[PDB]
Amino acid sequence: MREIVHIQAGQCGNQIGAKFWEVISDEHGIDPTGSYHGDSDLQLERINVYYNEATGNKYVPRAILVDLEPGTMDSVRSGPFGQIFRPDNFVFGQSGAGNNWAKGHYTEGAELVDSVLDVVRKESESCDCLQGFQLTHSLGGGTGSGMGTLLISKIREEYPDRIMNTFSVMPSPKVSDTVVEPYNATLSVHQLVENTDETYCIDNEALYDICFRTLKLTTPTYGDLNHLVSATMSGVTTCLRFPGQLNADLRKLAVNMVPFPRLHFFMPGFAPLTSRQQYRALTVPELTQQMFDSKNMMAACDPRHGRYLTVAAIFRGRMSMKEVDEQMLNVQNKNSSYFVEWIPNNVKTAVCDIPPRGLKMSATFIGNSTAIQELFKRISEQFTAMFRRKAFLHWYTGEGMDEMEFTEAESNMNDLVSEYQQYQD
Amino acid sequence: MEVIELNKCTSGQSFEVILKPPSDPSLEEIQKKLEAAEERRKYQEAELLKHLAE
Amino acid sequence: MYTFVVRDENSSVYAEVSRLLLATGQWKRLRKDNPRFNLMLGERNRLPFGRLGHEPGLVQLVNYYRGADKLCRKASLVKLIKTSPELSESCTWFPESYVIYPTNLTDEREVFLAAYNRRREGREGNVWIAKSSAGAGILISSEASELLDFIDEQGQVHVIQKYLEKPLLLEPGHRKFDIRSWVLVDHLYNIYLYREGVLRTSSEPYNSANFQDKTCHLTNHCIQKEYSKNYGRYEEGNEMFFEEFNQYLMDALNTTLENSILLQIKHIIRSCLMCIEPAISTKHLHYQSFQLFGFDFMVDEELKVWLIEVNGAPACAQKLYAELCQGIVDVAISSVFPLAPTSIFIKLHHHH
Amino acid sequence: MRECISIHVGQAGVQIGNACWELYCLEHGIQPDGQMPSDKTIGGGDDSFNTFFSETGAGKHVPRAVFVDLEPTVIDEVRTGTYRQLFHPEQLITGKEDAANNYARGHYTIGKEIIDLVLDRIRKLADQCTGLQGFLVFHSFGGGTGSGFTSLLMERLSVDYGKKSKLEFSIYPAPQVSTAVVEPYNSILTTHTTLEHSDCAFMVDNEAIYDICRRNLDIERPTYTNLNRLISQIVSSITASLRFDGALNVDLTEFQTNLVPYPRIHFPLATYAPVISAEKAYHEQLSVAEITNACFEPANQMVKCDPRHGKYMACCLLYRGDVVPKDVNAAIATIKTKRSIQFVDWCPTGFKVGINYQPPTVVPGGDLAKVQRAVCMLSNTTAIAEAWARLDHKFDLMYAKRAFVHWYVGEGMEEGEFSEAREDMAALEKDYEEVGVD
Numbered sequence A: 001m002r003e004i005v006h007i008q009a010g011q012c013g014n015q016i017g018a019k020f021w022e023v024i025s026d027e028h029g030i031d032p033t034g035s036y037h038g039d040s041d042l043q044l045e046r047i048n049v050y051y052n053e054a055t056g057n058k059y060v061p062r063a064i065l066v067d068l069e070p071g072t073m074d075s076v077r078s079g080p081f082g083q084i085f086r087p088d089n090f091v092f093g094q095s096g097a098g099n100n101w102a103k104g105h106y107t108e109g110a111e112l113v114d115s116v117l118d119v120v121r122k123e124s125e126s127c128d129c130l131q132g133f134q135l136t137h138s139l140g141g142g143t144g145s146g147m148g149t150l151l152i153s154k155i156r157e158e159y160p161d162r163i164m165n166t167f168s169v170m171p172s173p174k175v176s177d178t179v180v181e182p183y184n185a186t187l188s189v190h191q192l193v194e195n196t197d198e199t200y201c202i203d204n205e206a207l208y209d210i211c212f213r214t215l216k217l218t219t220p221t222y223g224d225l226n227h228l229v230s231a232t233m234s235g236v237t238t239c240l241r242f243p244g245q246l247n248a249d250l251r252k253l254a255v256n257m258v259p260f261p262r263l264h265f266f267m268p269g270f271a272p273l274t275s276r277q278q279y280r281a282l283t284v285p286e287l288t289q290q291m292f293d294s295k296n297m298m299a300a301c302d303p304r305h306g307r308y309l310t311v312a313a314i315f316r317g318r319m320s321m322k323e324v325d326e327q328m329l330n331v332q333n334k335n336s337s338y339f340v341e342w343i344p345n346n347v348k349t350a351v352c353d354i355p356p357r358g359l360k361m362s363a364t365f366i367g368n369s370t371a372i373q374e375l376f377k378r379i380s381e382q383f384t385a386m387f388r389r390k391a392f393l394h395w396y397t398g399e400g401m402d403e404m405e406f407t408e409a410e411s412n413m414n415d416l417v418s419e420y421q422q423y424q425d
Numbered sequence B: 001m002e003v004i005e006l007n008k009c010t011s012g013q014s015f016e017v018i019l020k021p022p023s024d025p026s027l028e029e030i031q032k033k034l035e036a037a038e039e040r041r042k043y044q045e046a047e048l049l050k051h052l053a054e
Numbered sequence C: 001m002y003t004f005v006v007r008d009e010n011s012s013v014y015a016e017v018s019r020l021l022l023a024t025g026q027w028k029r030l031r032k033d034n035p036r037f038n039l040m041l042g043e044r045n046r047l048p049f050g051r052l053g054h055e056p057g058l059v060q061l062v063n064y065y066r067g068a069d070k071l072c073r074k075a076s077l078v079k080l081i082k083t084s085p086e087l088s089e090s091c092t093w094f095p096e097s098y099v100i101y102p103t104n105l106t107d108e109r110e111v112f113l114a115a116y117n118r119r120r121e122g123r124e125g126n127v128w129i130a131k132s133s134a135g136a137g138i139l140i141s142s143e144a145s146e147l148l149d150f151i152d153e154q155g156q157v158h159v160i161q162k163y164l165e166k167p168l169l170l171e172p173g174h175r176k177f178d179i180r181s182w183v184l185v186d187h188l189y190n191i192y193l194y195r196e197g198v199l200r201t202s203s204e205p206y207n208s209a210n211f212q213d214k215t216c217h218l219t220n221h222c223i224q225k226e227y228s229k230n231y232g233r234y235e236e237g238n239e240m241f242f243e244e245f246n247q248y249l250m251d252a253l254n255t256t257l258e259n260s261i262l263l264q265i266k267h268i269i270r271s272c273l274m275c276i277e278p279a280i281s282t283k284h285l286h287y288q289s290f291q292l293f294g295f296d297f298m299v300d301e302e303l304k305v306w307l308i309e310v311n312g313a314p315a316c317a318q319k320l321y322a323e324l325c326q327g328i329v330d331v332a333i334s335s336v337f338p339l340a341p342t343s344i345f346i347k348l349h350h351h352h
Numbered sequence D: 001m002r003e004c005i006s007i008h009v010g011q012a013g014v015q016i017g018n019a020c021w022e023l024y025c026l027e028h029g030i031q032p033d034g035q036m037p038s039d040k041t042i043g044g045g046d047d048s049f050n051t052f053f054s055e056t057g058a059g060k061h062v063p064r065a066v067f068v069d070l071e072p073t074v075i076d077e078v079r080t081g082t083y084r085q086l087f088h089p090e091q092l093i094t095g096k097e098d099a100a101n102n103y104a105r106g107h108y109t110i111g112k113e114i115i116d117l118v119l120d121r122i123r124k125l126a127d128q129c130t131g132l133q134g135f136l137v138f139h140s141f142g143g144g145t146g147s148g149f150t151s152l153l154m155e156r157l158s159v160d161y162g163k164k165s166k167l168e169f170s171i172y173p174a175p176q177v178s179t180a181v182v183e184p185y186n187s188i189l190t191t192h193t194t195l196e197h198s199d200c201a202f203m204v205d206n207e208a209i210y211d212i213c214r215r216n217l218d219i220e221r222p223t224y225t226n227l228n229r230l231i232s233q234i235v236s237s238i239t240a241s242l243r244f245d246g247a248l249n250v251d252l253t254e255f256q257t258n259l260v261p262y263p264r265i266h267f268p269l270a271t272y273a274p275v276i277s278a279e280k281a282y283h284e285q286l287s288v289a290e291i292t293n294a295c296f297e298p299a300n301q302m303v304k305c306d307p308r309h310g311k312y313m314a315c316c317l318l319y320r321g322d323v324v325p326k327d328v329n330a331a332i333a334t335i336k337t338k339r340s341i342q343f344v345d346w347c348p349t350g351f352k353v354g355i356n357y358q359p360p361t362v363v364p365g366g367d368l369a370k371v372q373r374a375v376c377m378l379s380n381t382t383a384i385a386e387a388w389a390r391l392d393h394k395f396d397l398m399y400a401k402r403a404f405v406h407w408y409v410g411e412g413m414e415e416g417e418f419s420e421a422r423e424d425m426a427a428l429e430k431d432y433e434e435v436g437v438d
């Protein structure tokens, strides 16, 4: 019994989190009412990692829904699986955060954070042995970004020895809501560098390009992008939700993936990604080629621009584990110039027999690559283009922030970029 | 090629063949090591809480 | 796409092999410390054999046989011949040799003097030569006192062996020479003899009454090009190749290189390498080995062939680098890692 | 009769321990319920098998074993498995969260809080022994518990049982069956702090077992079950002398006397033959010469290395099955005339031979085929140093960048303990070279 507490904050965080529970509920045989209707014991083997067991054999997700406005969470509660969430785990305000990191972190968010922590504390007190926490949120808004990183800071204060994990959606001008997203992202990235153990970087531009160029979606919607995030979140957590000895728990995954405490930002990937030739069987060589192809990754970073510190691959479905090892060893041995040579055997592979819904087999990719610095470089450049003219700063100073805090967030991320650069050489 | 020390019993036998002749920390010190590492963990956590208190 | 690393930058032979491998567009060179390699062109000294063959999914191959130093060390070769029953102490193609440790350090001093005194009393030729592996450091003398005193002034193991006083002298010139044969042993332990050898000749007349001037007694390519005044007079770079040498043996001695010499060379190569095969074979090993050897022979006036030494990291004659290096790629590297004639080698068959 | 207590630490130790005791029971005719019909002394006795099994008044034969793991999932398999009835709950110790492949977490953070409990459970077993010899300790090098908690336990055992011998069965890390990148760190850290407390350690390289399973057993992708059943056959061959009537290696002290003349060089190489697939139509039974000759082939060594380029300090031949001394000496003579076997000049060139007439027992439904004769050779070669070199090299590559070091420092370990442990290994490699090379 190694329980994980799930938190989803803000519009993006709640919309992506909703789909996440919708996907894994289907995999574990949990219906919208919390009743189990699967046909395999593997589904319930590690079911208590994400679900609490209530009276009558009901399974309730260990999820906490947080937002500063009610709109998005009303939709979740009215959504497909909306009734499966614990009613008391909806914690929301009415003011909103106005896409403002300061409102989520210092003013509006501060007024609501204590009530969220009461729910977190309640979920933790019922855990036989809490592994840690995972948070879904975007970095470009106000609630998930500002109040999300506030929650992380206070969770770490109350549970300093638990693992903190996040799925963080990075903003992109191509899929943008407001011009202040680089401000909110730079402020959050510093908080993540300090107070998370693992952050899966999800770039909305990568998700967009995949929907447009690969999936052949003429006009991608947030829903389409979230389908990619759902499928990816299910892949990276397969190790935690089913029987296995590789990256079995959050701390063991961190120990194998994070060689330096600040370089804990991962590029995820998923395969296949087929446009609707969708019934064609996919071979192991094809799964591996795509899984390592940049076009299949969601950080919008070219891996051939940096080097992999560590890699974790997860293959799902009934397949030749012998042929898995062969193709994985083929990728490393045919491109070993992109893997640092001072971390021996830094590519780990894991197999799982249960494939995702509607797929004979799939592969999820988790890479700790120095190429991720390109993502922070983009954000830093957009930040400085506005900050050099102090554009849009009044939204933040009006909430009590000072310009010095922006300068420090700027330096902190440029330091992070420099730290990646030294390990790429 | 000599056989020596032949011992036989109901369940087996053993012998030696020669081809050629030839030519701590106390309980106290263990506790200090453990407690010293525990102290370094407490100090590091105190600095973390102090950082969070700021 | 096969991968290889280079760990000996001073190797002229494997510099060309590395150049050829890349020319195929099917081999990729990695940094010298990258362990994900198929082929290692290893260093001469302290090659880390223990780290080979532990990479999952990689068939790994190295260009040196672990333990072949026993054959390619002056003192080691002497000990191997005297102690191996396959070669025996009465081995008829290796000059009488003795291992002599300087007195400032088993040792065969007394055994050498016994055989030395026997020759001195029987009016026989008693000219010996002292040498070692730590040389560029050679002394030729007929007095045992000078030979032993010369070794004590040094601090490394030496070997004293009989000096061939009746060498075969080419004409015109009356000059000494030695024969260098290149031999490639692949991972299956096939013994391939390169069809091309080289006679490294002396450009000075052989003088048996003056062992003080060593230019006409030592046929090393570096000594002839530094202290000899007739370098390149008879043949380019004091290098006569088998075609010319064979034509000579026919015009002067009415015989062929194959009959008079090459049979003895092939016999010697087989005997040496078959002897150590059980100790260095990589048949059932987690990695594979091959290696290029440079055998050096001496021919006496009776057309009897003598083994001088075996070199583990030999160099090649300038005119023969292309052909031999391509051969190394064909039979030694591509035989394990195939690519997407009339062989230049002579297979010396034997029982494994 | 003198008792031996087996201690299993971490996932590797526990699962290998479970396979061994399964084999021990089939060998001694003990049923899953602990009953032993052949034992005519009910509730007691000082027979050879009593070194590993105690007895209750009801006739149950209970292993003298303690299982320890900082996480309950692996030991819960024993509590509900085929042999759940053999052990009682006091023998099975489990925590709630593991060491996360972190030596410092198993040794310091978690080890400090559970060490006194483990010692108490061992003390209960020791109090049943009339003349305890010592301990057999099973663990992996790579796990956080197997590495970190074992070294702490070995330190305390030397304190609480100063005059008792301690042997190890250690699992050397192999990437083909490992997902932990820091295992070289853990291996070197645990060897440094365990070196002075272990009298004799049998290393098994998972790479060797893995390839034997694929090559000889025709298993395309071996599992831990396949690996552990083969490992327990080798373990059984090594401990048979303590559990059966005999005169060779009859107590733990003799293991050191016959295998370890120099205390630091206490890692004997194990070689086992023959390993034959059960799925085979039917195999031609190998002779004493053929299986003995097999003991000098790298393919069947528990650690891949080249004994032709080392020097032997001791050599035991442990035969099980239809084997008479006449054939052993005949095959040995023939092997000397063909193989490269060089002993150190300060040791006799000889072989200690033990023969047990009972052929190897094979678990029903397992992968190994029944064979009429088998041998396990235990030789102390300097060639096994190749394994330290490999491991120390991987250590140097990561430590040069201080990769993953913060995980250990964060659990209370000082960075200086890395270099302190590495320097001890550098001295260990130097000792092997001084003994083996000229």
Ligand SMILES: Nc1nc2c(ncn2[C@@H]2O[C@H](COP(=O)(O)OP(=O)(O)OP(=O)(O)O)[C@@H](O)[C@H]2O)c(=O)[nH]1
Pocket (backbone or CB within 6 Å): D009, D010, D011, D012, D013, D015, D016, D069, D070, D098, D099, D100, D101, D102, D106, D140, D141, D142, D143, D144, D145, D146, D147, D171, D172, D173, D174, D177, D178, D179, D180, D183, D206, D224, D227, D228, D231
């Ligand atoms: N041969 C064999 N090796 C195993 C087995 N289980 C784990 N290993 C090896 O042990 C190493 C991992 O260490 P573990 O023993 O699993 O870890 P641990 O001792 O439980 O310590 P923790 O970090 O707390 O989990 C890897 O190299 C595995 O290949 C097993 O059942 N048989």
Ligand SMILES: Nc1ncnc2c1ncn2[C@@H]1O[C@H](COP(=O)(O)OP(=O)(O)CP(=O)(O)O)[C@@H](O)[C@H]1O
Pocket (backbone or CB within 6 Å): C095, C129, C131, C135, C136, C161, C162, C163, C164, C165, C176, C177, C178, C217, C218, C219, C220, C296, C298, C308, C309, C311
């Ligand atoms: N016993 C002997 N009788 C006659 N000449 C000898 C001899 N031993 C050595 N020589 C001469 O010495 C020369 C080379 O000696 P040696 O081979 O021992 O030194 P070396 O190893 O530095 C040259 P290489 O390794 O390139 O063959 C030969 O050309 C040979 O003519």
Ligand SMILES: Nc1nc2c(ncn2[C@@H]2O[C@H](COP(=O)(O)OP(=O)(O)O)[C@@H](O)[C@H]2O)c(=O)[nH]1
Pocket (backbone or CB within 6 Å): A009, A010, A011, A012, A013, A015, A016, A097, A098, A099, A100, A138, A139, A140, A141, A142, A143, A144, A145, A169, A170, A171, A172, A175, A176, A177, A181, A204, A207, A222, A223, A225, A226, A229
């Ligand atoms: N992938 C994805 N991104 C979103 C979604 N909704 C908003 N975003 C992104 O998140 C950022 C806006 O943050 P948002 O979550 O709406 O603000 P918040 O409610 O205050 O936390 C912008 O970069 C948007 O592009 C969504 O449903 N999916």
Ligand SMILES: [Ca+2]
Pocket (backbone or CB within 6 Å): A111
């Ligand atoms: Ca208010």
Ligand SMILES: [Ca+2]
Pocket (backbone or CB within 6 Å): D039, D040, D041, D042, D043, D044, D045, D046, D055
């Ligand atoms: Ca009894």
Ligand SMILES: [Ca+2]
Pocket (backbone or CB within 6 Å): D158, D162, D196, D197, D198
């Ligand atoms: Ca002791």
Ligand SMILES: [Mg+2]
Pocket (backbone or CB within 6 Å): A011, A012, A141, A177
């Ligand atoms: Mg919004």
Ligand SMILES: [Mg+2]
Pocket (backbone or CB within 6 Å): C309, C311
């Ligand atoms: Mg030489």
Ligand SMILES: [Mg+2]
Pocket (backbone or CB within 6 Å): D010, D011, D071, D098, D099, D143, D145
């Ligand atoms: Mg464990």
